[PDB]
Amino acid sequence: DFTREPRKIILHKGSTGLGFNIVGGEDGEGIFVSFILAGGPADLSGELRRGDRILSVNGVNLRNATHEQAAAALKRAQSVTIVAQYRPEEYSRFES
């Protein structure tokens, strides 16, 4: 992913959601994918990656979201349209 263009990713929830964990939104630093559950929707789609920043969900800007705002958006969303962008340098503040 040399351009680091954001990607539009369509996921459909199963019985236990989209199948990833979010980290961040503690201090204006944005919302990142920390964990992708094996055999959940996000995993099986293949598109989302650890260290993706979540830029938007169903048209809502999460760039400046708090953890709690992002959780609310993501939890309340069926067919969910995510815009994600690979940001390994920013993610390195979370995990080396």
Binding site: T16, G17, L18, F20, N21, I22, V23, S34, F35, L37, H67, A70, A71, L74, K75, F94
Partner: peptide, 6 residues
């Protein structure tokens, strides 16, 4: 660090 399943 706290993380949240979605």
């Amino acid at each position: 660090x706290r993380t949240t399943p979605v």
